[model samples]
Target: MDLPYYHGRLTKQDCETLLLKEGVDGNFLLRDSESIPGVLCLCVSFKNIVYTYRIFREKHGYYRIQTAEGSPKQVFPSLKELISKFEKPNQGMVVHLLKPIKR
Candidate 1:
């Protein structure tokens, strides 16, 4: 089944809201904080398929995105690009990271 893809970035809360509207359980959301430094593991599941992402800060001082371990490690220069690939049509999921609110 093809899923609706959201272009651009969203807050974690917004992501959760969209997931719940799609009938996904809140418990399916997971995160790992201890595995990689400067990187966070965020995963969500729908219809038994888990979509995972790694949001990391680069040595040169910028945020980037990548898939979790085992998946092809494609690096995105920005969070927007990562979400675009991961949430493509037929992918069955969407995700967003927590970002500070703009003043």
Candidate 2:
């Protein structure tokens, strides 16, 4: 994706290690989802846990992220817009995208 934080083929273990290797709460990164193709993961760390949220691309190429049930989903027109959405507090994740763990 040419995004610095977007680590292509980054393993699940590697993602966790990057996020939990004495990592900060807001340390986060983006990677291809391990379970299947054509999906991405929003991985963020907080309180001894790393939150893995699924991101799907719409038929129109928009971005949609997995969220708590029954709540309205978070969507963005582009990856840059997606990143900006979580840059602030209370925007649907455990914490804002404070410290983006780059490759």
Candidate 3:
């Protein structure tokens, strides 16, 4: 599927920054792999179904995306590739940002 276009690569730092700005906490999944300490799991609810992305930094400085536990990993050279995947129709995932309610 033709996913949405992104301007730059995605990284762990980028995810952290975005989550911080939106005030959402990501649940960390720990692993025994020496190369990867853990994976940051972010959840987004859409159409009553919860979708998640398991993001972790590889030793080579690229980010990896795992759709679910035990799913084959999708290696992205940059963050751009990561976000672009969500832009597709099949991915069906969206990033939600919190807005302040005004009285």
Candidate 4:
């Protein structure tokens, strides 16, 4: 919750508005999963659209990202590190994770 970009319990509409309003590609944020319990969501901005991916918290406290079925699921020991992996261009997301949309 302390992560500036992490907006807990944010509605999908709110997330959309915030990200889209910025009008900058690679702007991103984290929010609680709307339909999935105990899961977090990573919202990315690209081409005036907001794309979403799920981040599942493992039993051990590590975090797992929802990658393609054939691809390996990237796991990180913490939420901070998880997002950092995609901070570099083309890690797994559509674009690099750049500036965050703080709540």
RMSD of each: 9.2, 1.2, 10.3, 1.1
Clashes of 4: 0
Candidate 2: tens digits of C-alpha lDDT, residues 24-86: 788889999887798999898898688888889984899998568866887889888988988
Q: Model 2, stretches more than 4 Å misplaced? A: none
lDDT of 3: 0.44
- lDDT (C-alpha, whole model) for all candidates: 0.45, 0.85, 0.44, 0.87
- The residue-level lDDT of candidate 4 at 61 comes to 88
Instruction: Find the candidate with the highest TM-score and give its number.
Output: 4
By TM-score, is 2 or 4 better? 4
- True lDDT of residue 82, candidate 4: 81
Q: Residue pairs in steric clash, candidate 3?
A: 9-79, 9-80, 10-78, 10-79, 10-80
Per-residue accuracy of model 4 over 1-103 as CA lDDT, tens digit each: 7999999999999899999887899899999999889999999889998888899988588888865666788889999898888888877677788988888
Q: Whose lDDT is higher: candidate 1's or candidate 2's?
A: 2
> TM-scores of all models?
0.40, 0.92, 0.43, 0.93
lDDT tens digits, residue span 1-103, model 1: 1213322244555545544555543223323334565565455544534455666766464545544445454556654555555544543235333221121
Worst 10 residues of 4 by lDDT: 66-75
What is the RMSD, in Å, between candidate 2 and the native fold over all Cα? 1.2
